[PDB]
Amino acid sequence: AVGYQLLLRMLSDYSLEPTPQVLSNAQRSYDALMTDTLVVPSMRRRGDFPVGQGNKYDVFTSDRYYPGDLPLIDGDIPN
């Protein structure tokens, strides 16, 4: 992948035009490389979404509602 990409990027130095087979091979290698480093995010709960009564929430714990992104601003520095 790296070699084909840099070859495509440095061919113009010698003023030559790439062939379709080279382009296809470079595309295939790049697609494989992108497939390797692939991550798909998962959408977590909004934060005000209620938790059902079947989960048996309790006080002293924040289990009543789904834990969203905490603000992480506490003390005097928030204000």
Next chain:
Amino acid sequence: HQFSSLRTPTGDISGQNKNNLISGKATGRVGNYITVAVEYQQLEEAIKLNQLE
């Protein structure tokens, strides 16, 4: 107790330091006896001492 206040443009006091709580007291004590004493002989009260009260 006495206190002092800060002054910030947005209410942010992270860098600065807070007030302390120093306690002081006033102590009083007892003084010395105020004693007055007199004495006299038996014969002085027998003859001389009149209107002792």
